[PDB]
Design a protein around this ligand. Structure first.
Ligand SMILES: Cc1cc2nc3c(=O)[nH]c(=O)nc-3n(C[C@H](O)[C@H](O)[C@H](O)COP(=O)(O)OP(=O)(O)OC[C@H]3O[C@@H](n4cnc5c(N)ncnc54)[C@H](O)[C@@H]3O)c2cc1C
Length: 271
């Protein structure tokens, strides 16, 4: 039983950045040292951490789901999309936290906190979902899990997929629908397609793209009722639907169409 990094959620833990990996122009894996090589992070599956820093005089807090797990000793890995300044004409200053991460030098610390979130995956189909931070968790056991992700919204889903996938006696089937703007913006694609090759009986993978390339075998356009009926488990299976992506996708593309297909609001969970 290893030592836990996040011992209480009311404490902020400054972790040293020990490595940087450039994945693409705007995507990067950051590795931080846990307090000892024999430490784990202490992050229930289904929950996330918060990074906090004072940037330009404002406290900035942002949630992140690590790519690493409590099976990893000594370190935590986050995969970060960097929103640069002077790139998108509508958002000229870029992203606050993600540019702060990009500017960190090896040996700089940044504050972690957690674990946080209203959902915990308790394993083999059992999800424990609190209706609010003070209410107690309601337990629902499901045969299948629908997953809609947009952008960096994949890491909450990856954490759950890998947690299922590595338990040979977990027969939960995950149906992922993964939306992004263009093909370069599909994050963690090598990983996702590796899980497809090795676990297709429990993992179904589909994509869509706002602006699809000419050679594209998957979805074109925003998530709709047809893709939800086609690439997510049917309501009659009483699945749980997990969601994480930009607020516009949740509000305009997911929630209304899940309702039209027939997914009850209690079985829909927005990270
Ligand atoms: C449960 C959960 C898990 C998450 N996990 C991850 C994770 O693993 N990795 C990760 O990177 N993020 C993750 N996110 C997203 C994260 O919380 C932040 O929203 C993200 O890092 C952007 O924050 P920011 O402060 O850098 O940008 P902000 O200053 O908060 O603004 C970001 C927003 O500004 C706009 N924007 C700014 N610059 C640009 C640009 N150049 N081009 C286009 N739009 C732009 C976009 O609307 C963008 O969404 C997660 C979120 C949640 C809720």
């Amino acid at each position: 039983t290893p030592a836990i990094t996040l011992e209480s959620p009311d404490i902020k833990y400054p972790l040293r950045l020990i490595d940087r990996e450039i994945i693409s122009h705007d995507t990067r894996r950051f590795r931080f040292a846990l307090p000892s090589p024999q430490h784990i992070l202490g992050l229930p599956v289904g929950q996330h951490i918060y990074l906090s820093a004072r940037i330009d005089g404002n406290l900035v807090v942002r949630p992140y789901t690590p790519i690493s797990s409590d099976d990893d000793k000594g370190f935590v890995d986050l995969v970060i999309k960097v929103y640069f300044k002077d790139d998108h004409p509508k958002f000229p200053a870029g992203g606050k936290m993600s540019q702060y991460l990009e500017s960190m030098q090896i040996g700089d610390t940044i504050e972690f906190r957690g674990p946080s979130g209203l959902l915990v995956y308790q394993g083999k189909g059992k999800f424990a979902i609190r209706p609010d931070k003070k209410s107690n968790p309601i337990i629902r056991t499901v045969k299948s899990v629908g997953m809609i992700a947009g952008g960096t919204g994949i890491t909450p889903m990856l954490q759950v997929i890998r947690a299922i996938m590595k338990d040979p006696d977990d027969h939960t089937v995950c149906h992922l629908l993964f939306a992004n703007q263009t093909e370069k913006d599909i994050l963690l694609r090598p990983e996702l397609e590796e899980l497809r090759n090795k676990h297709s009986a429990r993992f179904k993978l589909w994509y869509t793209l706002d602006r699809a390339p000419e050679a594209w075998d998957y979805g074109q356009g925003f998530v709709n009722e047809e893709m939800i009926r086609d690439h997510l488990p049917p309501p009659e299976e009483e699945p749980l639907v997990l969601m994480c992506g930009p607020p516009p996708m949740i509000q305009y593309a997911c929630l209304p169409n899940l309702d039209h297909v027939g997914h009850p609001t209690e079985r829909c969970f927005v990270f």
